[PDB]
Amino acid sequence: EEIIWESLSVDVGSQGNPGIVEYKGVDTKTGEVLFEREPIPIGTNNMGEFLAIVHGLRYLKERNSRKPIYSDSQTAIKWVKDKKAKSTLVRNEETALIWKLVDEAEEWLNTHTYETPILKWQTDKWGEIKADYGRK
RNA sequence: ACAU
DNA sequence: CGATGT
Ligand SMILES: [K+]
Ligand SMILES: [K+]
Ligand SMILES: [K+]
Ligand SMILES: [Mg+2]
Ligand SMILES: [Mg+2]
Numbered sequence: 001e002e003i004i005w006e007s008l009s010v011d012v013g014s015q016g017n018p019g020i021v022e023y024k025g026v027d028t029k030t031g032e033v034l035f036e037r038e039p040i041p042i043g044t045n046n047m048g049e050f051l052a053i054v055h056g057l058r059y060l061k062e063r064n065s066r067k068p069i070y071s072d073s074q075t076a077i078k079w080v081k082d083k084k085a086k087s088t089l090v091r092n093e094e095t096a097l098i099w100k101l102v103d104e105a106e107e108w109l110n111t112h113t114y115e116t117p118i119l120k121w122q123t124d125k126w127g128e129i130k131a132d133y134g135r136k
Numbered sequence: 137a138c139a140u
Numbered sequence: 141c142g143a144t145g146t
Contacts, residue, residue: 012140016142016143017140017142017143017144018143018144019143044143044144044145045140045143045144045145046140046144046145047144049140049144072139072140073139073140073145074138074139074140074145074146075139075140075144075145075146076140076145077139078145078146079145086145086146087144087145088144088145089144120139123139123140136140137146138145138146139144139145139146140143140144140145
């Protein structure tokens with residue numbers, strides 16, 4: 001503890017896993033939605049969580065903001081730190097789009113810098129992350 | 137087991 | 141109940 005209220009919170013939403021994947025980013029203090037990704041027909045929860053963090057890094061850098069990012073995904077936080085999304089999702093024609101976005105997000109991480117702290121949202125102490133979709 |  | 145991940 002405790003919550004850094006001056007932050008951006010991100011989360012994935014899906015219809016199936018693998019299935020249709022979307023994500024959004026919100027102001028932790030207010031819940032204002034700051035970005036939302038158009039649904040991607042097939043992806044995994046963890047690919048979506050990864051894309052959401054990277055989009056948040058890009059969003060904050062473009063705006064010269066030093067705010068931290070909260071994610072509830074141990075996996076996606078590690079993948080961003082490693083600059084490598086270690087997804088098991090088959091690469092085929094159906095999954096081409098999500099894998100293109102994941103590849104492009106890795107490419108961005110490998111060509112840009114950032115100081116943004118990427119913090120674990122402590123769901124067991126604080127309840128659901130503010131960017132949650134309410135689908136569970 | 138933990139995080140989704 | 142099923143799936144994605146460390
Ligand atoms: K949900
Ligand atoms: K959760
Ligand atoms: K498991
Ligand atoms: Mg989540
Ligand atoms: Mg959620």
